[PDB]
Each structure stands twice: as C-alpha cells, then as structure tokens.
Amino acid sequence: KGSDLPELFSKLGLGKYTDVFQQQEIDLQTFLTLTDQDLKELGITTFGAREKMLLAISELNKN
Template identity: 60%
Template sequence: MFPTLTEENLMELGITAFGARKKLLAAIHTLLANEAACSSLPSSSSSQSSSPRFSGSAAPGAERRPSNQW
C-alpha cells in the first residue's frame, strides 16, 4: 500500500502541509530502499540454526520467584 501512495493520496487523507507530505514520501522511499537492500543480502539462517534458541525456560541456576510476588 505505501509504495503506491502519492501526494494526492496524502492530501485526500488530510495531510495538507507540503512539507509533511514530502517528509512522509521520503520516509516511505527510504524504508523501501532499506527493505530492498536487506532482501538482497544473503540469508543468515544457516548460521542461526546452529546457535541455541530461547526455549522459554530459565537458564540453569537462574533464580525463580513464585508468581504471587509480582
């Protein structure tokens, strides 16, 4: 949706200030450029698969508190 927004669309949404429209369009353009740059990077999933993932439990030896203390 955002890539297709135009100045006219922003005016219809009530963003009448010229500077605000330009800032929004520039921010959208920057986000899209960053997204394109990130998608062109090689996937790091292979390096993450060998690292341990959070299991949802506390680390060995970690202090546990009863839930009624909060």
C-alpha cells in the first residue's frame, strides 16, 4: 500500500526523502513507474540513493 512508503524509505536509509515525495504528491502506483531520470528531477542527486530506490521499486514490482 502507498501508506507503506515512509516505512520503506526508513529501512532503506532513505527516510530523509520521505518529505519530498509527499510534497510532490507521489502515490504508490506512480512510485512503481519511476526511472532514474524521474528521481533526478525529484531532487535525488546521489547515485547510491537513486539506485537503492530503483532496486526497491524493481523488487516491489517483481513480488
């Protein structure tokens, strides 16, 4: 569920980005479609953060 994103970010060590995604109105179905370029436009400027998010998205879509 979309309400699970903050907990997800927290365990990924990405809790610092939770506020930007809420302010940018990103819901679960949008989140699951994001690419590296989308994350860059969202302000995620370090590779390690973007890649962790993309791999997380990939796992959520696989399961």
